[PDB]
Design a protein around this ligand. Structure first.
Ligand code: MG
Ligand code: MG
Ligand code: MG
Ligand code: MG
Ligand code: MG
Ligand code: MG
Ligand code: MG
Lengths: 250, 222, 235, 237, 243, 204, 196, 198, 233
């Protein structure tokens, strides 16, 4: 019953820092590496499934999440914060967009909505910031493909390619080396896999790696035929098997 | 309006005519009364046209969010439960009458919902001003365990009873087929037996026929 | 919110401290237009330049802001400023006079300074607008909610150094093209980077609609910034 | 209060308990068809009117409540216990089962260990009664914790009372009747008074027995009380 | 005493000490528990310690029937345990009312983890000092184990174990599934799955159990139920004639 | 009386080859009393055109509301709203007032600036979308408009010919409605340009 | 509508016709008017189909929550929940509900909740528009502690008369048998019951 | 029924408003000024239901005056009329709607043009060369269709108005006790104090 | 132990003490002495009124709650007003709804529960006043003592305030005599007046000093001050 801390828990310090936002960023550093690479005809988001137990079933925990049929997200930092951000993000895409315009939000707008949700946790009374950074990749008719990073402060930035979390500094270097503007999606998935191998401690296979693409429309994933102007999701989670095929040619 | 619902051995079929009316005047000669709640749950509405579209889209929206949240294919009983609870709340004032049909992990389902929030279940259903015309066809030809083809023929024939005998209905027959294994198939203008005959004369006017007072080019951008 | 023994607002002071670390933003007003230039926060090769707009934002068709500080705070404020412009347009069938919009934004900032025990917004704005009462205008607003009018101003880092230079080379009878040169010169001199290159820059103007009688905002595409950077002899 | 210590404890709740230990000693005993509640009333002064400062409380018609610690906190619980029992009876027609009633208090007490704007309750409460399927006796600590009991004690003489309680359980595994347990309650309250013997006391007893009170909660008064006082007086020496 | 140790705000290292402390609270009862999946059942076993001889042993449980189909075992103090049990029950009834079908095990767990994440983020709530293990035979997923902690974290398990001596039991089961290569126990009867659970508890903890030392919950297609002392005694008898 | 009869007013939109046309009368009345000879009922947000008939206060109010909403759209999205999207925004906007509806009969016309394909839609007062590929009619002479259109219309007309057809439809329907007329205005819309013509009609 | 519940020796039986009308049109000839709110608590609904369905669904919700916390609800508890909703909302509901249940202790019990929101415990209950025609017949033929087969006959005969006279009643006769056994669904088609 | 006329000539806008206030079988007043000045160059006249009439006028006047002092500026006649329309538009769907019809006459100093706005209680706004509310329009609209010219002087406008007042005095069943006439131009608002027998 | 444990009423000390409530108890001990006592037929309040100067009036210490009930106060006076108004309303409520005079014991319970909520709510202090309540209801004369902790006890007699321990010891000694003083209003008052004297290091209790209240079998609750107390000095 009733909150006592109706004041901001993120305040400015004598030097101009916002401590809690700094400390959430330090949490993102401690988290498992995730990355995004933009190609000419798609985006790839990838991360490692770091398991709590060998007795756990890692298929039941998705780090990669569909946000709308053409937008997907991955994170580094505190898992549960991600999970609830994903719920709010899906809802907001409906309440603030689809229920109004009859179509799904373009990438930047949804990212902007997510940013707002995180911005608020930085200003409101009696809350800490979210302990995550997200990578949001998507497609829309008028903007093409995009990749955005969203930070605990509420800040977002568009990226050609980037990595967040543990090995992020080395992985970002490995991406500046490898990225160009002629990359096909298949090349990008291949680079994503290479970059992720430096980060992975243990086994590196389709069971321990999580990887999704924003590529082309998947009419077989639509669930109905008949309406010719509805072609299906561009978001697609690659299977364990699919990953392994690209590791034997890696 | 004529909307029907027919269960067969491995699924469920819904169908509808394609006439919208403001009183005696036909507004749209070929609209679509078959709507999607989710990929495999489909809906047909009669009564207030804006109401059946809106209640369908709202519940559709929520069903998608549920599906994503629970990591499961949407069920027909969820659509039915949300619709009836919503309609009931609005005591009737949302004049949505619906035949909701679909397939989900638990089999195949066919339901009716009335505006005040009551639901019924059945093997064959009809709603609309053409409801009686259709039902007499349905009561004449329905049997247990229809093959897909028979169910489409029956549902199609029922919409025709509505089209030919009810002034509230006309034009074309839309169909949607939901089978347990497969993707749902939407079949736009499955029948078109009401083609306007070619007119007796062309009415295109000689240019300059219309007196014009003044004129100007209009700016679109900035 | 509370006062100090000195009669200062701690949180406001520290918010201003924060801003003095943000990439410098310059605004210069000329008789026939306005210049907005700002420097991006030490970037990376992999940062998408074409689909990026972190420091410059359109408010309505006749007003823009340059941002210094927390972007996420600035987006919150920009969005409300956008609504305020649309409310005024709907009420009066006239585009909002520039000052009225600035005052309103400023007043929202003042509020977080006086009640509610929330932190202030860590944002300073330079407003660049045109209206049919005062012509071209330039305003500045900081987390205190204070606002002031200028002919030339900077926010963020090195305002101290940038202000002295603008004071030196600013002359009331300038054309826009002269103000463009001044803004880029001033950024170049004050930068903590080596060369001031196109990819570290956001740039915008408000002119007299190429050839018309109407007012037009140009938010420079990256390529345009590269050209205008060779032109003024910094390559 | 909403504060876990480095090793998982709640120091505020622990301190709440010290207030209970500080309090008078109260007990409950589960006989084969009911429950007996007894409490030590310290007489501060002869000016206190005898029999007229009733500590034992009834909830609905079939439940008794006794507690040790900050008395006002106990009254606060019983108020809430009553609202909670009315609410249940209203919707469900039947008077509230004792385990059902136990949890209502349980959740309410636990709630007061979730927030910094609240302090935990400074009581432990021994309560119970007869329902649809037998007799029940409960004890609920400041933390929200509660379990079923054969016998229960709390307060100053808690330790010696439990020792007596433990003995009864061992010698009588087959039942103890309501009439018997009343006597023993009086006895045990005498044998926890030994600690606070510097100040005088008064004994209160109530019971809820299927055969003796027809499943309603009643105060033990008159000849029955006097006889139980004698049994305790004779068995103290 | 810094604020970052009294409420759920970040420490300079990015940690939430109140969440960490809440985990320590889960062991305070010194009770261990484990869960395994059969071919068409799921079994939870938990120790039952009744130290005080004034207690009614039948009211001493850490196993709850959340719905007709879902059971939940808690590691942590009972006051918080019952708080969670009550919530789950209400969330379960409500789900069925609104969506027309029984709330799945994992969905409930997800929901409970979300409530936990809220206590992890809002200042005025403390986390609950409990770990919740949810079990059923889901109508879509089959036998299921899902476990939620004070961090708001949850996942599905082949089998799991919780409590002070949790590691012993975990590595035991890990060794079993290394041997069998499958992710359940092949076994027809729930009775034999319970026996396996009790057996592997005995080796791992190196202790014998009487019928009053144990508490058992079993979930089969469409019920979840708990075994009485007598059904457990029968189970204990059967293990003895071979092991 | 009937709120959609007080002020009078008609709007009609047609599609043709690579074009759309939208037209309205100019009358603004108060029952029998003609009040304004100059009351336009068509508007445009970027290249998207919206005609509105019905109660004139709601016509005005909705114009101001759709200007507001499209202005904000353009700022967030960095592009002009398209025909199909606007149609959706009108619908949801009307349905939001389900039990206190605007007494209007909106009509949307335009060309998708990507696909270049002609688009028209109609709505009822609570936002029910009438998707039609040929013509849409609205107002106190909608019966007469339906008759005129169904007789005069043929698909794929050239902008110069579609102009005659829509004008003839409007003029003659307007001349059978006591509350429509008093001058007319016709927009012809081709991707690249928009011509606007005031017609000469009876002034009674 | 013709609905009835009858207590007999071994438990209780619910019966109903299967017809739903809007005016003189039969919207549904095969309706299931027998509604389960718990395993061995069932009810028959009359009045507004919307109102009573919504009520039944809330009661089912309350009893499921009840079973989770406190165990099997008594029939009286089920009736009390129904009455609460019906009484507290008498001025938005046209709901006439008959409640019938079985538990081991109290055996077979019947409660009728008519329009007002009052509750009445009865050895048997009739309701719905077709009931009016069978007040004489039922009062003349009901006995206490009948056998299952006798009771089934009593409902079968009663409902067939109700169907015969009331145009709103008709179709098939559905029954639900509630005992220790067990739950048993019965059905009887016009060709059988009309010949009675 | 309350006469409310306005005519826009070339360099000014002229408002004329009946002087009677009638309740029941009694004329309580024959000198009622049914006008409020909104700003030095904007005038508004009003007619409608008994109480809402003055209450609405004065509320608008307070608002426009507030604006002027806040901005040290006079809002264009077009902006004032938009403000007025929106207030009436919101009002019509409120609990108890303002039953007032208005004429706004303004001289726009930035364009040097006179402007006349007719707005009814529904929030129906339209700019007119001449306008009227109530029954009076049923006479005056046709007269002015005939006699009105876009280039008339203020003096010609006053003759045209006198012609309108004569028609109403002849044909209207009620006695409205003549009008108060007001002229809005560049040099502001002034009243023609002699009209009743001028 | 004493450190950060008296911040608010929402903190327990490591000893299980609530210092805010213990400090509120100290405001009573600071207050001017007051005595209440009863027999079977009457109950009497006697209070030592206190001035704040020689030019001031002695501030009132006895408040009437209903015809059959009233109280005296010691400690923070505005708190007495808050509490007596509540009691006035509870008495009033019982009369209007049930046509029933409120049992003095129920008034005890009610005041107790009201005090309690201020020993548990953050950002609210406890009541800082002690009260003695007398009344005649359907079971005779009653006297209660109210502590800000919420504890209410029914007594034959008692005293609260500065140096009150004197009067209490006397009343403990007089018990068997004053309990029997029945049908004699004036004897019981004179017994109470002399009881309050044991608590005087002060001065001699004057005609302004003294405040007496009575209620009983056939006497409505009435207050005596000024000239009307002279005959008991
Ligand atoms: Mg037809
Ligand atoms: Mg104890
Ligand atoms: Mg707290
Ligand atoms: Mg917290
Ligand atoms: Mg029409
Ligand atoms: Mg006409
Ligand atoms: Mg019949």
């Amino acid at each position: 019953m009733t909150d006592r801390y109706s004041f901001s828990l993120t305040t400015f310090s004598p030097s101009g820092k916002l401590g809690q936002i700094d400390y959430a960023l330090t949490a993102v550093k401690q988290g498992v590496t995730s990355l995004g690479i933009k190609a000419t005809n798609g985006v790839v988001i990838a991360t490692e499934k770091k398991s709590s137990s060998p007795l756990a079933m890692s298929e039941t925990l998705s780090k990669v999440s569909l946000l709308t049929p053409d937008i997907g997200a991955v994170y580094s930092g505190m898992g549960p914060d991600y999970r609830v951000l994903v719920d709010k993000s899906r809802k907001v895409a409906h309440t603030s967009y689809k229920r109004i315009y009859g179509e799904y939000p373009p990438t930047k707008l949804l990212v902007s909505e997510v940013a707002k949700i995180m911005q608020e946790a930085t200003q409101s009374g009696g809350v800490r910031p979210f302990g995550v950074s997200l990578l949001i990749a998507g497609h829309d008719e008028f903007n093409g493909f995009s990749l955005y990073q969203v930070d605990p402060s509420g800040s977002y930035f568009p990226w050609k390619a980037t990595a967040i979390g543990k090995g992020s500094v080395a992985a970002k270097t490995f991406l500046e080396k490898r990225w160009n503007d002629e990359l096909e999606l298949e090349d990008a998935i291949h680079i994503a896999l290479l970059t992720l191998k430096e980060s992975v401690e243990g086994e590196f296979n389709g069971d321990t790696i999580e990887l999704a693409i924003i590529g082309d429309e998947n009419p077989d994933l639509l669930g109905y035929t008949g309406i010719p102007t509805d072609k299906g999701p561009r978001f697609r989670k690659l299977t364990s098997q699919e990953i392994n095929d690209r590791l034997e040619a890696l | 309006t004529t909307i029907v619902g027919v269960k067969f051995n491995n699924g469920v079929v819904i169908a509808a005519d394609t006439r919208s009316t403001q009183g005696p005047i036909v507004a749209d000669k070929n609209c679509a009364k078959l709507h999607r709640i989710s990929p495999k749950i489909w809906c047909a509405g009669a009564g207030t046209a804006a109401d059946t579209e809106a209640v369908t889209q709202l519940i559709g929206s929520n069903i998608e969010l549920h599906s994503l949240y629970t990591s499961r294919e949407p069920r027909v009983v969820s659509a039915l439960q949300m619709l009836k609870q919503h309609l009931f709340k609005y005591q009737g004032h949302i004049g949505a009458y619906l035949i909701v049909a679909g397939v989900d992990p638990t089999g195949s389902h066919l339901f009716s919902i009335h505006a005040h929030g009551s639901t019924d279940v059945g093997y064959y259903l009809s709603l609309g001003s053409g409801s009686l015309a259709a039902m007499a066809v349905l009561e004449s030809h329905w049997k247990q365990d229809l093959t897909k083809e028979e169910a489409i023929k029956l549902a199609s024939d029922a919409i025709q009873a509505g089209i030919w005998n009810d002034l509230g209905s006309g034009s074309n027959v839309d169909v949607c087929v939901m089978e347990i294994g497969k993707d749902a198939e939407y079949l736009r203008n499955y029948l078109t037996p009401n083609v306007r005959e070619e007119k007796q004369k062309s009415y295109k006017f000689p240019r300059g026929t219309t007196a014009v007072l003044k004129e100007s080019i209009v700016n679109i951008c900035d | 919110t509370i006062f100090s023994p000195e009669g200062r607002l701690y949180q406001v002071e520290y918010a201003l401290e924060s801003i003095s670390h943000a990439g410098t933003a310059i605004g210069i007003m000329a008789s026939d237009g306005i210049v907005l230039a700002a420097e991006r926060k030490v970037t990376s090769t992999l940062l998408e330049q074409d689909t990026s707009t972190e420091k410059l934002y359109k408010l309505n068709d006749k007003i823009a802001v340059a941002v210094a500080g927390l972007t996420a705070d600035a987006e919150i404020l920009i969005n409300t400023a956008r609504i305020h412009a649309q409310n005024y347009l709907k009420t009066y069938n006239e585009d909002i006079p520039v000052e009225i919009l600035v005052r309103r934004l400023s007043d929202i900032k003042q509020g977080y300074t006086q009640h509610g025990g929330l932190r202030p917004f860590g944002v300073s704005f330079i407003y660049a607008g045109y209206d049919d009462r005062y012509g071209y205008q330039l305003y500045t607003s900081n987390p205190s909610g204070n606002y002031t009018g200028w002919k030339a101003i900077s926010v963020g880092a090195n305002t101290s150094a940038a202000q002295t230079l603008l004071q030196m080379d600013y002359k009331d009878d300038m054309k826009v093209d002269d103000a463009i040169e001044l803004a880029l010169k001033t950024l170049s001199k004050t930068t903590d980077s080596s060369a001031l290159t196109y990819d570290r820059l956001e740039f915008a103007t408000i002119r007299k609609g190429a050839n018309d009688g109407e007012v037009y905002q140009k938010i420079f595409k990256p390529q345009e910034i590269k050209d205008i950077l060779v032109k003024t002899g910094i390559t | 209060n909403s504060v876990f210590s480095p090793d998982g404890r709640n120091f505020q709740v622990e301190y709440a308990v010290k207030a209970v230990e500080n309090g008078t000693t109260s007990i409950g005993i589960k006989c084969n068809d009911g429950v007996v509640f007894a409490v030590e009333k310290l007489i501060t002064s002869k000016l206190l009117v005898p029999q007229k400062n009733v500590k034992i409380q009834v909830v609905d018609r079939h439940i008794g409540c006794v507690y040790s610690g900050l008395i006002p906190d106990g009254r606060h619980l019983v108020n809430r216990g009553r609202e909670e029992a009315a609410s249940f009876k209203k919707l469900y027609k039947t008077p509230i089962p004792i385990p059902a009633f136990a949890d209502r208090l349980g959740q309410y007490v636990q709630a007061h260990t979730l927030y910094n704007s609240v302090r935990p309750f400074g009581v432990s409460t021994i309560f119970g009664g007869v329902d649809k399927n037998g007799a029940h006796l409960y004890m609920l600590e400041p933390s929200g914790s509660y379990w079923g009991y054969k016998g229960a004690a709390t307060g100053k003489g808690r330790q010696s009372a439990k020792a007596e309680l433990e003995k009864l359980v061992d010698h009588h595994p087959e039942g103890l009747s309501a009439r018997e347990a009343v006597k023993q309650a009086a006895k045990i309250i005498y044998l926890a008074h030994e600690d606070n013997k510097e100040k005088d006391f008064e004994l209160e007893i109530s019971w809820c027995s299927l055969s003796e009170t027809n499943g309603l909660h009643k105060f033990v008064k008159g000849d029955l009380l006097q006889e139980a006082i004698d049994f305790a007086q004779k068995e103290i020496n | 005493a810094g604020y970052d140790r009294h409420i759920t705000i970040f420490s300079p290292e990015g940690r939430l000490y109140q969440v960490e402390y809440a985990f320590k609270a889960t062991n305070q009862t010194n009770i261990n528990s484990l869960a395994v999946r059969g071919k068409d059942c799921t079994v939870v076993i938990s120790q039952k310690k009744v130290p005080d001889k004034l207690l009614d042993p039948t009211t001493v449980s850490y196993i709850f029937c959340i719905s007709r189909t879902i059971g939940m075992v808690v590691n942590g103090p009972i006051p918080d345990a019952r708080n969670a049990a009550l919530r789950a029950k209400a969330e379960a009834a409500e789900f069925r009312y609104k969506y027309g079908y029984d709330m799945p095990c994992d969905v409930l767990a997800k929901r409970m983890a979300n409530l936990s994440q809220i206590y992890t983020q809002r200042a005025y709530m403390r986390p609950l000092g409990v770990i919740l293990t949810f079990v059923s035979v889901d109508e879509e997923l089959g036998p299921s184990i899902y476990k939620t902690d004070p961090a708001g974290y949850y996942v599905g398990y082949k089998a799991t174990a919780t409590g002070p001596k949790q590691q012993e039991i975990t590595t035991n089961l890990e060794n079993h599934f290394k041997k069998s290569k499958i992710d359940h126990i092949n076994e027809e009867s729930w009775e034999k799955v319970v026996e396996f659970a009790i057996t592997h508890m005995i080796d791992a903890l190196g202790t014998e159990f009487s019928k009053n030392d144990l508490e058992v919950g079993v979930a089969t297609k469409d019920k979840f139920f708990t075994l009485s002392a007598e059904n457990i005694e029968e189970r204990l008898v059967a293990i003895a004639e071979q092991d | 009386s009937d709120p959609s009869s007080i002020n009078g007013g008609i709007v009609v939109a047609m599609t043709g080859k690579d074009c759309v046309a939208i037209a309205c009368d100019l009358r603004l009345g108060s029952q029998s009393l003609g009040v304004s000879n100059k009351f336009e009922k068509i508007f445009h947000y970027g290249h998207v055109f919206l005609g509105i008939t019905g109660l004139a206060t709601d016509v005005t109010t909705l114009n101001e509301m759709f200007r507001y909403k499209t202005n904000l759209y353009k700022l967030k999205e960095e592009r002009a709203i398209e025909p199909e999207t606007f149609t959706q925004l009108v619908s949801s906007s009307l349905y939001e007032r389900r039990f206190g509806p605007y007494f209007v009969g909106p009509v949307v016309a335009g060309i998708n600036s990507k696909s270049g394909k002609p688009f028209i839609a109609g709505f009822d007062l609570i936002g029910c979308i009438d998707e039609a590929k040929d013509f849409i009619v609205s107002g106190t002479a909608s019966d007469q408009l339906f008759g005129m259109c169904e007789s005069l219309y043929e698909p794929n007309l050239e902008p110069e010919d579609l102009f005659e057809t829509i004008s003839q439809a409007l003029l003659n329907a307007a001349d059978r409605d006591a509350l429509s007329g008093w001058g007319a205005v016709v927009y012809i819309i081709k991707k690249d340009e928009v011509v606007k013509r005031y017609l000469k009609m009876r002034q009674d | 509508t013709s609905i009835m519940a009858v207590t007999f020796k071994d438990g209780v039986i619910l019966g109903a016709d299967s017809r739903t009308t809007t005016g003189a049109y039969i919207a549904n000839r095969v309706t299931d008017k027998l509604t389960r709110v718990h395993d061995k608590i069932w009810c028959c609904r009359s009045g507004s189909a919307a109102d009573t369905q919504a009520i039944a669904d809330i009661v089912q919700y309350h009893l499921e929550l009840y079973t989770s916390q406190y165990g099997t609800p008594s029939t009286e508890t089920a009736a009390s929940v129904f009455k609460e909703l019906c009484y507290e909302n008498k001025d938005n509901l046209t709901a006439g509900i008959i409640v019938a249940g079985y538990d081991d202790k109290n055996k077979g019990e019947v409660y009728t909740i008519p329009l007002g929101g009052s509750v009445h415990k009865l050895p048997y209950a009739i309701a719905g528009s077709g009931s009016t025609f069978i007040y004489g017949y039922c009062d003349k033929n009901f006995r206490e502690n009948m056998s299952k087969e006798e009771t089934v006959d009593f409902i079968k005969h009663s409902l067939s008369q109700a169907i015969k006279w009331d145009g709103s009643s008709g179709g098939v006769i559905r029954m639900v048998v509630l005992t220790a056994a067990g739950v048993e669904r019965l059905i009887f088609y016009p060709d059988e019951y009309e010949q009675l | 029924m309350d006469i409310i006329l306005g005519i826009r000539v070339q360099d000014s806008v002229i408002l004329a408003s009946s002087k009677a206030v009638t309740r029941g079988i009694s004329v309580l007043k024959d000198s009622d000024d049914k006008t409020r000045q909104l700003s030095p160059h904007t005038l508004m006249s009003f007619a409608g239901e008994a109480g809402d009439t003055v209450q609405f006028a004065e509320y608008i006047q307070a608002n426009i005056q507030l604006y002027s002092i806040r901005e040290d500026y006079e809002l264009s006649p077009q902006a004032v009329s938009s403000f007025v329309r929106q207030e009436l538009a919101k009002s019509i769907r409120s609990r108890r709607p303002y039953q007032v019809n208005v004429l706004i006459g303004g001289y726009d100093k930035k364009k040097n043009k006179p402007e006349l706005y007719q707005i009814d209680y529904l929030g129906t706004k339209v700019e007119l060369p001449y306008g009227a509310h109530g029954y009076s329009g049923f006479y005056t609209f046709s007269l002015l269709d005939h006699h009105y010219r876009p280039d008339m002087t203020t003096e010609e406008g006053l003759d045209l108005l006198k012609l309108c007042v004569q028609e109403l005095e002849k044909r209207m069943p009620m006695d409205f006790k003549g009008v108060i006439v007001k002229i809005v131009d560049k040099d502001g608002i002034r009243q023609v104090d002699d009209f009743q027998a001028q | 132990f004493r450190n950060n444990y008296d911040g608010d009423t929402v903190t327990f000390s490591p000893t299980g003490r609530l210092f805010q409530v213990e400090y509120a108890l100290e405001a009573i001990k600071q207050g001017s002495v007051t005595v209440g006592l009863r027999s079977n037929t009457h109950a009497v309040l006697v209070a030592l009124k206190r001035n704040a100067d020689e030019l001031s009036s002695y501030q009132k210490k006895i408040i009437k709650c209903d015809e059959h009930m009233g109280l005296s106060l010691a400690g923070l006076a505005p708190d007495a007003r808050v509490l007596s108004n509540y009691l006035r309303q509870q008495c009033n409520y019982s009369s209007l709804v049930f046509n029933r005079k409120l049992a003095v014991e129920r008034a005890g319970h009610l005041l107790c529960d009201k005090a309690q909520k201020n020993t548990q709510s953050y950002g609210g202090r406890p009541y800082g006043v002690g009260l003695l309540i007398i009344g005649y209801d359907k079971s005779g004369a009653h006297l209660l003592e109210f502590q800000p902790s919420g504890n209410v006890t029914e007594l034959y007699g008692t005293a609260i305030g500065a140096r009150s321990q004197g009067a209490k010891t006397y009343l403990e000694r007089t018990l068997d005599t004053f309990i029997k003083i029945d049908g004699n209003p004036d004897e019981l008052i004179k017994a109470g007046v002399e009881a309050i004297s044991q608590s005087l290091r002060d001065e001699s209790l004057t005609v302004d000093n003294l405040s007496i209240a009575i209620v009983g079998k056939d006497t409505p609750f009435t207050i005596y001050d000024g000239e009307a107390v002279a005959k008991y000095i």
